Amino acid sequence: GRGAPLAIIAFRDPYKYKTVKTTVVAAEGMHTGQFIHCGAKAQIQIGNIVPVGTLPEGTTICNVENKSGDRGVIARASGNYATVIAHNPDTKKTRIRLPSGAKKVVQSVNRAMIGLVAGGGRTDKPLLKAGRSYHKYKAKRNSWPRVRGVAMNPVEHPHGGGNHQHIGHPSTVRRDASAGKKVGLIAARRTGRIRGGK
Amino acid sequence: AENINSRLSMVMKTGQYVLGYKQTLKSLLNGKAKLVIIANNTPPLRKSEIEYYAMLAKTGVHHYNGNNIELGTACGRLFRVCTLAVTDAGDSDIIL
Amino acid sequence: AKRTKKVGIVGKYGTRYGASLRKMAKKLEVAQHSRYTCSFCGKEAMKRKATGIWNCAKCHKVVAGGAYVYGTVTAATVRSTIRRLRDL
Amino acid sequence: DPFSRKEWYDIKAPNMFNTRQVGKTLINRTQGTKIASEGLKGRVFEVSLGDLNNSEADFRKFKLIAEDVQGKNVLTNFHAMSMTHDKLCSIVKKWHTLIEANTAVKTTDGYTLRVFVIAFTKKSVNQVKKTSYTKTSKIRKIRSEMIGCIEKEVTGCDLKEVVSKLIPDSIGKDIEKTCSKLYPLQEVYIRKVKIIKRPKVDLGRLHDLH
Amino acid sequence: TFKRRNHGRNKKNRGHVAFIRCTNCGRCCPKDKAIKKFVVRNIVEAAAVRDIGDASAYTQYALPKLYHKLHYCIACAIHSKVVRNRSREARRDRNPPPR
Amino acid sequence: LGPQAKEGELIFGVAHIFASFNDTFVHITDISGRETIVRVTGGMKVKADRDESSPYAAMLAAQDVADRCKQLGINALHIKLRATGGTRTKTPGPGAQSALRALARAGMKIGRIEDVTPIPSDCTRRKGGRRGRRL
Amino acid sequence: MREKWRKKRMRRLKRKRRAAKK
RNA sequence: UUUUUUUUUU
RNA sequence: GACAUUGUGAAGAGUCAGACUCU
RNA sequence: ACCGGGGGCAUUCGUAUCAUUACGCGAGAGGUGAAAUUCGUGGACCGUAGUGAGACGCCCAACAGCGAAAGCAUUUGCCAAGAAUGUCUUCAUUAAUCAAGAACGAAAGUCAGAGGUUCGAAGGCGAUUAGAUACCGCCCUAGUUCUGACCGUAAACGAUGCCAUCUCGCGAUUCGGAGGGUGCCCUGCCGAGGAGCAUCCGGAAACGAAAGUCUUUCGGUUCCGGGGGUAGUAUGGUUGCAAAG
């Protein structure tokens, strides 16, 4: 169900005689038998888990911590990564750029892994067959196949019904619409093909 | 850098050598290895082992600027060489 | 003899799915079914196990790589940047 | 009258310069949460070395940034240096090679300064050749010499001494006298100086400066 | 009929020369082909130099100068009369005209 | 209204004179340039758009600027000449000389004159087409 | 810009002829 | 700023 | 949006005659 | 201490354009032949100081250089290559031109992924006009930029194929060398370039130190033309995703 490979890593418990195993999404280039250093004094190497405050601007990171201690929540899909845009030592904050293009401010102590998530380029090969979609979603959840609303009857969908298959009403619905009505382009700021940059 | 290639070629053409980790170890043990050359992708454990042997035998180790494919090409072979021992410089100045 | 003039590996799909889609699938199918030179042992023995996992038949090293290529261009540039920063 | 709310303040340059009187600025008087002193803190004033030291180096311009206000006095400190457009345009001439360089040099108090140097190949005394070009390898060598000399001059000093050396442009003359071994140089100047990184404001040090 | 031996340019030993945008029209013209004019003037017109001097705040101030390098395409140069057409023989003269 | 002049001291402002071919700005500010004393443009003095850049309009604007400067006690001006610059023309428009001479005649002492036309190391593409303005 | 336009005209004609032949 | 035309042969 | 949960300090502005109001 | 904007990959810097933040201003700004569309008191434009993006490397910059041509210009590092010059070094005819065949090949254009500052086909408006599907102005989409692939055409021009050889004078210029004087000067210095003006002969002439050494024709070799159109059209073949070659 995940497009990015996982890395099983073994650490030594500092307080008892035992081994602790960690399961994290692997950064590309990580290999079995490699050593990963996690902490505030770890160096800048692929796979190391370090606070974002220690990184230079332009560094690419993954598994970014939205809040200090949440154990890595951002840029976890295959091939994705965030970038360190800027620092502010006075407030002890770091500005980063998320995969979606948004810019977010985090505490400089938030940890992240250096590198980008492995398995990139997955969504370039077409899923030529419908069976491939079937197998893809049989490992994730029940969200396939997708029946168009216009193909339904008016009892089950706002778009259903009619002697011709048509919506009949604007497909852009307000944000505060009711549960059974909020279908289509929700709170759409604009529609149509994007001509330019957005 | 570019000099070691020429010196190695001269050794291969005139000197005496052994290609490979096992013969390198044996030659170090029996003390007929004038020099040991190690490719840069040699396993870290094997590298440490060969350097320990060279320290015991008072022999020089040269870290070739290339992996075993290029080291074999430099040796003039069509296979990969990760370690080699020059036992007689022949008509070359590789040892010095 | 050359069995197929241009379809190559995607000849398994017959006449289905469209010429352009089969052409797009061909590059990545060839890449994912190719064998790559391992950076640890130096032999052409790296094969894809699953999307993003590449195993070496000789040294038995498993690497996290691309979905259909052993290494990605973005990962290469990131590695170059880290190495450059380390040097300077 | 909207000008009734404005109070006049007096700009004061640091002690590197002879004339400590620069001019008069103005700002709205304090009203509610807006404080005139806080508003003034941060302004930048562009003055000429002719109006600061009355020397002939009129073409050198200095930017002074206000870090403190006392009574009706605004104490400023060095912020940037630049040459005048007229001077630069006059300097640039045809049939000559122009050599430019820039370098980041760190003072001893935490100021990182980017220094931009400009130079031109000089004609020999008994030269018949119209042009005074030279080999590009020599251009590169001269550029490296200029960078090295600027580093030697700046590094080891602090902002006050580097400003003192900029005021007469001693560095430019030293370049024109040293780097000329490869090719005689002319009209060598420190075209510009800007601050990349600066330390936190030290009101104590600014006071010794004023 | 070939009008000029240089074909209206100054391109020898060269394949391609980058263009410049004319001063008036903005048209792209090769740098070797464009009419170039280096103009050095007083910052203030000749008729007001006395007024500026008598209003000067300094005992002795050297009035600066404007330096402009102008590039003209052939059309906008001929129209502005920066350059003029010449007889067939006078075309080959290459010395700058008296100023 | 104004500063305390020391019995003959020259109170200095800065006169930014932006003389484009369509208009002319005479903009008075302090030494810092962050506070403006008075500004007048040719369009404020002339009704027709065609004469916004006329030397007479520049002269009238400079005369009003001089009057206000004298009222507020500014008696000297550092000139800052400017043209459109950038990718556009680098030569000052026809109102620059009129404005400067008008200030001088009004009586404001003239300090240092400098040209601050924005000039690029290199540019974005210019406005016209590759063939220019064919008219 | 007199023969280049004839080239354009003939290219349009050839496009129409291709479409009709198909 | 605007400024398009001038039947055939001789 | 109002009231309650809802506490402890500063700065500004406005009301009053030490309180209130807001920001 | 070689020579060079020759090529590639990384990297540094610069103002400018645009957007935006803070502060001041106060009603225009923009644009034109004149205007209008447009922006502007929700305070534009203008100032000063920052911030961000992408593009581009002014001046220096030239009858200068390099490259097979197309083309090539911010600093630095790395990578491979090369010209000329020097040579009492080496091999010894290994050479010239080349059907078929192959690489490279401006701009536009096509496909995929990123970017989208500026400019800007198409499109939409404001003008001008008898009309104006245009020139002018305003807002812009593809594109312009990067990466990986296609296309293989330009007034891709010096409208002059390549190799060798002979025929004129002058003084300049780029690179290297030789010899002197103090980086520059001199040597009617030697080669190799890129030109210019004194040019035999040639040419229908314009003009050409080659377009000369051709009825006194004949150094070698490749490609091409045969009055103007129809027409680079039809058809066939082949290449391409298409446009088209």
UniProtKB/Swiss-Prot annotation, chain A:
GO terms for molecular function: RNA binding; rRNA binding; structural constituent of ribosome. One of its GO terms (cellular component) is cytosolic large ribosomal subunit. Its main location: cytoplasm. It is found in: Cytoplasm. Signal peptide: none annotated. Keywords: Cytoplasm, Ribonucleoprotein, Ribosomal protein, RNA-binding, rRNA-binding. Residues 156-178 are annotated as: Disordered. GO terms for biological process: cytoplasmic translation. Belongs to the universal ribosomal protein uL2 family. This is Large ribosomal subunit protein uL2. It comes from Caenorhabditis elegans. The chain holds residues 53 to 250 of 260 of the full protein.
Swiss-Prot record, chain D:
Its main location: cytoplasm. One of its GO terms (biological process) is translation. The keyword Ribosomal protein applies. One of its GO terms (molecular function) is structural constituent of ribosome. It comes from the Eukaryota. It is found in: Cytoplasm. Keywords: Cytoplasm, Ribonucleoprotein, Ribosomal protein. One of its GO terms (cellular component) is cytosolic small ribosomal subunit. Component of the small ribosomal subunit. Mature ribosomes consist of a small (40S) and a large (60S) subunit. The 40S subunit contains about 33 different proteins and 1 molecule of RNA (18S). The 60S subunit contains about 49 different proteins and 3 molecules of RNA (28S, 5.8S and 5S). Belongs to the eukaryotic ribosomal protein eS1 family. This is Small ribosomal subunit protein eS1.
Swiss-Prot record, chain E:
One of its GO terms (biological process) is determination of adult lifespan. Residues 86-96 have a biased composition (Basic and acidic residues). The keyword Ribosomal protein applies. One of its GO terms (cellular component) is ribosome. GO terms for molecular function: mRNA binding; structural constituent of ribosome. Component of the 40S small ribosomal subunit. Belongs to the eukaryotic ribosomal protein eS26 family. This is Small ribosomal subunit protein eS26. It comes from Caenorhabditis elegans. The gene is rps-26. The chain holds residues 2 to 100 of 117 of the full protein.
From Swiss-Prot, chain F:
GO terms for biological process: ribosomal small subunit assembly; ribosomal small subunit biogenesis; translation. It holds the Pfam family Ribosomal_S11. Disulfide bonds: none annotated. Keywords: Cytoplasm, Nucleus, Ribonucleoprotein, Ribosomal protein. One of its GO terms (cellular component) is small-subunit processome. Signal peptide: none annotated. Gene3D superfamilies: Ribosomal protein S11. One of its GO terms (molecular function) is structural constituent of ribosome. It comes from the Eukaryota. It is found in: Cytoplasm; Nucleus, Nucleolus. Belongs to the universal ribosomal protein uS11 family. Component of the small ribosomal subunit. Part of the small subunit (SSU) processome, composed of more than 70 proteins and the RNA chaperone small nucleolar RNA (snoRNA) U3. NCBIfam families: PRK09607.1. HAMAP family: Ribosomal_uS11. Component of the small ribosomal subunit. The ribosome is a large ribonucleoprotein complex responsible for the synthesis of proteins in the cell. Part of the small subunit (SSU) processome, first precursor of the small eukaryotic ribosomal subunit. During the assembly of the SSU processome in the nucleolus, many ribosome biogenesis factors, an RNA chaperone and ribosomal proteins associate with the nascent pre-rRNA and work in concert to generate RNA folding, modifications, rearrangements and cleavage as well as targeted degradation of pre-ribosomal RNA by the RNA exosome. This is Small ribosomal subunit protein uS11.
